[PDB]
Amino acid sequence: SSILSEVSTRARSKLPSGKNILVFGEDGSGKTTLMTKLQHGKKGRGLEYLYLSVHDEDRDDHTRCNVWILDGDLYHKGLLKFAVSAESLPETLVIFVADMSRPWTVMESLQKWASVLREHIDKMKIPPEKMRELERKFVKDFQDYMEPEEGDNVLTHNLGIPVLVVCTKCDAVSVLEKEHDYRDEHLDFIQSHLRRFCLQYGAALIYTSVKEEKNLDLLYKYIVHFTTPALVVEKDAVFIPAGWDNEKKIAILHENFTTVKPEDAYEDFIVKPPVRKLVHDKELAAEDEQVFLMKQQSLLAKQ
């Protein structure tokens, strides 16, 4: 009656299921423009869903890669519940997006978003305890595969699942050195911290710009199931796939006159345009007076 229905359900297996993406939209930074360059109503609510259904390596078999874009911080945790389930967990390509117009934001705000998801790990994954004892070992599998066939040990992190740190607004390099960069220290230090962040986080570092770098879908399609050779060469736009690291190449990079590993220069680039000034500010507390007070004060002034 239904035995052959069982066999019929077992006929084919070329069925890539419901894929998910959790990008972290960060105050403009071309995020609406990021999906626009990829493929827009308005961006004021956050959790602005998008669905990707792109080429399934030979045709498009509706690679149903559901996107999610949050922006701000006002309790959007429940929205993450509406974006992260218990079965969503494998196909969870989280993408951290930040600009270059404000690189200092990126430096800390990445950890802001990160800590939000660290909470969400211990807030939503606390009931599924099977992927604790399973996915941590699967991450021990997974991050051993982070490094080979690309082209030992590092002080990596606790976060391990398919993760990725991207950057945006990079075609503003000359605009920023035109304003205040004009120093290889500023260019090397940020990349050392970024590539450093990604290698610790068990992720990779990717850049993009206005009308540039279609290297995005390569790693996602490549991972969410087409490979590509890396670049740290141009240094005006960088692509770091996972496993193209060490803790020495970058050490030589932040050595070439770059104030060797400064743990205060966060204020250097977190001081040029964020501690620029305030043009439109009206904190004056201008004027206000009394009646009776002035009257009797003039009485004392009457002598």
Distance CA 106, CA 84 (A): 24
Distance CA 50, CA 180 (A): 37
Distance CA 231, CA 278 (A): 38
After which residues is the chain discontinuous, taking C to N > 2.5 Å? 39, 151, 225
Residue-range definition of the domain harbouring residue 291: 16-300
Does 129 reside within a domain?
yes
Does 110 reside within a domain?
yes
Does 10 reside within a domain?
no
Query: Is 31 marked within a binding site?
Result: yes
- Our count of domains for the chain comes to 1
Query: Is 101 marked within a binding site?
Result: no
Give the distance from CA 72 to its chain's centroid.
13
For residue 62, the SS3 value is coil
Experimental method: cryo-EM
Distance CA 276, CA 252 (A): 31
CB 46 within 8 A of CB 69: yes
What sections of the chain are H helices per DSSP? 3-9, 31-38, 77-81, 103-124, 130-142, 173-179, 184-201, 216-224, 249-253, 292-300
Give the distance from CA 110 to its chain's centroid.
6
Query: Is 169 marked within a binding site?
Result: no
Say which CATH number the domain at 206 has: 3.40.50.300
Q: Which of 6, 13, 76 shows the shortest CA–CA distance to 48?
A: 76
Does 6 reside within a domain?
no
Q: What is the DSSP string of 286-297?
A: -----SHHHHHH
The resolution in Å comes to 3.4
| β strands within 1-115, DSSP E | 19-24, 50-54, 63-67, 69-70, 92-96
CB 103 within 8 A of CB 59: no
Query: Is 32 marked within a binding site?
Result: yes
Pairing status of strand 50-54 against strand 63-67:
antiparallel
Does 253 reside within a domain?
yes
CB 2 within 8 A of CB 141: no
**Residues 48, 49, 54: CA angle, nearest 5 degrees:** 140
Distance CA 25, CA 69 (A): 5
Does 242 reside within a domain?
yes
User: What sign for the dihedral angle of Cα 215, 149, 256, 195?
Assistant: positive
Residues 6 or more apart whose CB falls under 8 angstroms from that of 15 comprise none
Distance CA 90, CA 22 (A): 12
Does 1 reside within a domain?
no
CB 42 within 8 A of CB 36: no
Query: Is 28 marked within a binding site?
Result: yes
Query: Is 30 marked within a binding site?
Result: yes
Does 126 reside within a domain?
yes
Query: Is 151 marked within a binding site?
Result: no
Q: What is the DSSP string of 216-247?
A: HHHHHHHHH------B-SSSSS-EE-TT---S
Query: Is 78 marked within a binding site?
Result: no
Q: Which of 181, 201, 192 shows the shortest CA–CA distance to 263?
A: 192
For residue 196, the SS3 value is helix
Long-range pairs of 190-193 with CB within 8 A, sequence gap ≥ 24: 190/103, 190/107, 190/269, 191/235, 191/238, 191/250, 191/253, 192/250, 192/251, 192/253, 192/254, 192/258, 193/107
